[PDB]
Design an enzyme around this catalytic site. Structure first.
Site, PDB file in Angstrom:
ATOM      1  N   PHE A  32    -122.902  85.059 -50.609  1.00  0.00           N
ATOM      2  CA  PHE A  32    -121.504  85.021 -50.209  1.00  0.00           C
ATOM      3  C   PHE A  32    -120.760  86.067 -51.027  1.00  0.00           C
ATOM      4  O   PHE A  32    -121.086  86.301 -52.183  1.00  0.00           O
ATOM      5  CB  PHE A  32    -120.895  83.617 -50.370  1.00  0.00           C
ATOM      6  CG  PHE A  32    -120.776  83.146 -51.792  1.00  0.00           C
ATOM      7  CD1 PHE A  32    -121.776  82.374 -52.369  1.00  0.00           C
ATOM      8  CD2 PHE A  32    -119.644  83.443 -52.550  1.00  0.00           C
ATOM      9  CE1 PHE A  32    -121.659  81.919 -53.685  1.00  0.00           C
ATOM     10  CE2 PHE A  32    -119.525  82.993 -53.868  1.00  0.00           C
ATOM     11  CZ  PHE A  32    -120.530  82.233 -54.429  1.00  0.00           C
ATOM     12  N   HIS A  92    -114.051  98.441 -63.348  1.00  0.00           N
ATOM     13  CA  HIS A  92    -113.328  98.468 -62.082  1.00  0.00           C
ATOM     14  C   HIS A  92    -113.905  97.458 -61.101  1.00  0.00           C
ATOM     15  O   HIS A  92    -115.068  97.556 -60.707  1.00  0.00           O
ATOM     16  CB  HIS A  92    -113.347  99.875 -61.482  1.00  0.00           C
ATOM     17  CG  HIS A  92    -112.505 100.860 -62.232  1.00  0.00           C
ATOM     18  ND1 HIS A  92    -111.523 100.473 -63.123  1.00  0.00           N
ATOM     19  CD2 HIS A  92    -112.498 102.214 -62.233  1.00  0.00           C
ATOM     20  CE1 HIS A  92    -110.948 101.546 -63.635  1.00  0.00           C
ATOM     21  NE2 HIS A  92    -111.521 102.616 -63.111  1.00  0.00           N
ATOM     22  N   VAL A  93    -113.077  96.489 -60.718  1.00  0.00           N
ATOM     23  CA  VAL A  93    -113.484  95.413 -59.820  1.00  0.00           C
ATOM     24  C   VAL A  93    -112.909  95.625 -58.418  1.00  0.00           C
ATOM     25  O   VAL A  93    -111.824  96.179 -58.253  1.00  0.00           O
ATOM     26  CB  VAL A  93    -113.043  94.030 -60.371  1.00  0.00           C
ATOM     27  CG1 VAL A  93    -113.601  92.886 -59.522  1.00  0.00           C
ATOM     28  CG2 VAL A  93    -113.502  93.878 -61.817  1.00  0.00           C
ATOM     29  N   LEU A  94    -113.663  95.200 -57.411  1.00  0.00           N
ATOM     30  CA  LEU A  94    -113.225  95.260 -56.026  1.00  0.00           C
ATOM     31  C   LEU A  94    -112.532  93.959 -55.613  1.00  0.00           C
ATOM     32  O   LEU A  94    -112.785  92.909 -56.202  1.00  0.00           O
ATOM     33  CB  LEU A  94    -114.424  95.529 -55.118  1.00  0.00           C
ATOM     34  CG  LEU A  94    -115.214  96.800 -55.407  1.00  0.00           C
ATOM     35  CD1 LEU A  94    -116.487  96.821 -54.588  1.00  0.00           C
ATOM     36  CD2 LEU A  94    -114.353  98.009 -55.100  1.00  0.00           C
ATOM     37  N   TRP A 152    -119.097  96.200 -49.608  1.00  0.00           N
ATOM     38  CA  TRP A 152    -120.067  96.661 -50.601  1.00  0.00           C
ATOM     39  C   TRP A 152    -121.422  95.984 -50.390  1.00  0.00           C
ATOM     40  O   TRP A 152    -122.457  96.646 -50.321  1.00  0.00           O
ATOM     41  CB  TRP A 152    -119.543  96.393 -52.018  1.00  0.00           C
ATOM     42  CG  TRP A 152    -120.361  96.998 -53.129  1.00  0.00           C
ATOM     43  CD1 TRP A 152    -120.281  98.278 -53.610  1.00  0.00           C
ATOM     44  CD2 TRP A 152    -121.374  96.342 -53.913  1.00  0.00           C
ATOM     45  NE1 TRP A 152    -121.183  98.455 -54.637  1.00  0.00           N
ATOM     46  CE2 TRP A 152    -121.862  97.284 -54.842  1.00  0.00           C
ATOM     47  CE3 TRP A 152    -121.911  95.053 -53.914  1.00  0.00           C
ATOM     48  CZ2 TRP A 152    -122.855  96.976 -55.761  1.00  0.00           C
ATOM     49  CZ3 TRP A 152    -122.905  94.745 -54.834  1.00  0.00           C
ATOM     50  CH2 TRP A 152    -123.363  95.701 -55.745  1.00  0.00           C
ATOM     51  N   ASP A 168    -121.210  77.983 -54.055  1.00  0.00           N
ATOM     52  CA  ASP A 168    -120.783  78.524 -52.771  1.00  0.00           C
ATOM     53  C   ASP A 168    -119.542  77.790 -52.244  1.00  0.00           C
ATOM     54  O   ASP A 168    -119.549  76.568 -52.127  1.00  0.00           O
ATOM     55  CB  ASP A 168    -121.937  78.424 -51.765  1.00  0.00           C
ATOM     56  CG  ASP A 168    -121.663  79.146 -50.446  1.00  0.00           C
ATOM     57  OD1 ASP A 168    -120.509  79.163 -49.956  1.00  0.00           O
ATOM     58  OD2 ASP A 168    -122.633  79.690 -49.874  1.00  0.00           O
TER      59      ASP A 168
END
Length: 402
Positions: free
Chosen positions: A133, A152-154, A162, A256
């Site tokens: 997930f 650096h985080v998305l 990604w 999850d």
């Protein structure tokens, strides 16, 4: 197959990293799917895998700093292998790598590790699934690394795209498929002699058009008759009885968001459920009546609203002698198969020691360069101690010149 060698082939020439792959031996675990009324759960084993990747800011120095960590759980039943990504985080110190090319090393590593585990856990005639997930969150792995200004985080949408890009090259090593509940042409004998695969993506709250926005651009050129990315849940490939109660049709993975929901819905059931000779054991939820309605109501959960999204991904691989039209079969009994060990880590730890290895890592500090370098040396030694080796892992130099 060798992990370090596989990885060396995909990394850019001159990229040097160190890898430590630790695993645990397969041990019994709770089934991924809840049993329908009147049946026992499928016998299930789980194998933990963890890969830590580090770099040396100065070569010919003991100095390592971890740049990436990925945990993967491999589940096995008689009829399904499931490769599930449970954890994946970076530390933000990858920039300390002299001359580090522009391709996402983290994407390449994740791809290679999953590829590796698929090659080594693939059983003849047995369906294999890669699953995960995708959502931005408080990953266990590297505390304080969030304070590192270089990490650096998305956001959710970026992470979903990604992870699809990680999966896409794995997907495309296999043959295209025509459709499970589709026309029974002579695509049966074609797709059966070869290993084939399709990728499935669901992002609750997003319609079939917006969801295609998450697909890799490679999907633009796939033919209408053989798509490799589908916006749906591969129910008939995962479940032997698509008519069983919805609570039995969805897999239950650690941490999850969808399992969190499943557990809340399960608590709508009477407690007489499960009890011997019960008359309240239909397994039907109060507020959700079908699988379709489960995905709809997922979109109203905390993880899917007020601007948050999560994507659920299933890569389903059908080995030679199996097409995507062959429905999953049940291994349940009414109320131990062979597990090949070729993808074991540098260290195979007991269940207890593996937990200690991960917890030790989580108890460390990665706020600054100096603290992270210290945490790395510390964890590396701890692993070595648990493994009864002097030094665990190997160094890898990229070979890919393209």
């Amino acid at each position: 197959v060798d992990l370090g060698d596989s990885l060396a082939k995909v990394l850019p020439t001159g990229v040097k990293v160190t890898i430590r792959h630790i695993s645990s031996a397969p041990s019994p675990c709770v089934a991924l799917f809840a049993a329908p009324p009147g049946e026992e759960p499928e016998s299930t084993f789980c194998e933990n895998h963890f890969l830590a990747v580090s770099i040396s800011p100065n070569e010919n120095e003991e100095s390592e700093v971890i740049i990436f960590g990925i945990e993967v759980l491999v589940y096995g039943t008689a009829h399904l292998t499931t490769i599930f990504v449970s954890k994946a985080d970076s530390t933000g110190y990858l920039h300390l790598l002299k001359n580090a090319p522009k391709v996402s090393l983290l994407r390449l590593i994740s791809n290679a590790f999953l590829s590796f585990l698929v090659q080594t856990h693939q059983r003849p005639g047995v369906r294999l699934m890669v699953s995960l997930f995708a959502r931005a969150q408080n990953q266990y792995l590297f505390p304080g690394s969030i304070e590192n200004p270089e990490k650096h985080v998305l956001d959710d949408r970026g992470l979903i795209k990604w992870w699809c890009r990680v999966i896409d090259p794995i997907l495309r090593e296999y043959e295209p498929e025509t459709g499970s509940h589709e026309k029974a042409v002579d695509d049966q004998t074609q797709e059966s002699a070869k290993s084939s695969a399709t990728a499935f993506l669901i992002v609750p709250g997003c319609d079939k058009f917006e969801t295609r926005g998450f697909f890799p651009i490679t999907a633009r050129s796939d033919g209408k008759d053989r798509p490799r990315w589908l916006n749906s849940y591969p129910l008939h490939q995962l479940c032997d009885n698509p008519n069983a109660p919805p609570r039995c049709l969805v897999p239950r993975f650690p941490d999850d968001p969808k399992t969190r929901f499943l557990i809340d819905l399960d608590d709508e059931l009477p407690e007489s459920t499960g009890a011997a000779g019960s008359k309240e054991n239909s397994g039907h939820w109060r507020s959700v009546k079908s699988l379709a309605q489960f995905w709809e109501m997922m979109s109203f959960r905390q993880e899917c609203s007020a601007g948050r999204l999560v994507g659920f991904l299933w890569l389903v691989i059908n080995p030679p002698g199996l097409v995507n039209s062959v429905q999953m079969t049940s291994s349940r009994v009414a109320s131990a198969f062979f597990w090949p060990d070729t993808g074991r880590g540098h260290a195979v730890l007991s269940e207890e020691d593996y937990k200690a290895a991960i917890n030790f890592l989580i108890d460390q500090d990665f706020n600054t360069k100096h603290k992270a370098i210290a945490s790395t040396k510390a964890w590396a030694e701890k692993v070595a101690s648990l493994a009864d080796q002097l030094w665990v892992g190997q160094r890898v130099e990229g070979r890919n010149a393209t």
